[PDB]
Amino acid sequence: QTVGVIVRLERETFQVLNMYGKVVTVRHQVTRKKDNRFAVALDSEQNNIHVKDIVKVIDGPHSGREGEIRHLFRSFAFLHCKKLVENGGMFVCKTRHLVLANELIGQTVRISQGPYKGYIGVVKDATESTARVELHSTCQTISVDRQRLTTV
């Protein structure tokens, strides 16, 4: 449920600064999560910010500093300052306190409507509207609208 960024490489532990402002000390065996490089965050001016953007701190316990965006959360942003000497420049600030400087898959279905009516198939892939049905009787996989499919 919690993400983090390591600030110092040690022999048997990881020094990671999470969204606390406090550096924790954990073992090697943390897991890896896919970073959202296309995530969108909002500052106090409701302006869109993304990765590698310089933002200023105007509120919070550390107002006045300036940081660069590395990773994003729902209400937090990771900051870097090369002049800041604590924990290798890693820090965290809240997003609003800154300013810019299917279940159908694998199920057997019946096409109950249309030209392929009566054909029995297994859904290989599906969306909100269409579904890829692997027909039992033919060698074809066809795209069927999900309003024409009945799960059997």
Binding site: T108, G118, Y119, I120, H136, S137, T138, V152
Partner: protein, 46 residues
């Protein structure tokens, strides 16, 4: 959990578990076949 195989020699319904050897329980034949699936098998008559 309960899996049925059919012996290739004597054609016997064989309840065996997993990781136990493929061995017919009353004739000892070591080749068995899976039963036909219970899923829906529908073909157009073309």
């Amino acid at each position: 959990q309960p899996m049925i195989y059919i012996c290739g020699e004597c054609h016997t319904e064989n309840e065996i578990k997993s990781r136990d050897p493929i061995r017919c329980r009353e004739c000892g034949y070591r080749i068995m076949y899976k039963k036909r699936t219970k899923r829906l098998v529908v073909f157009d008559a073309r």
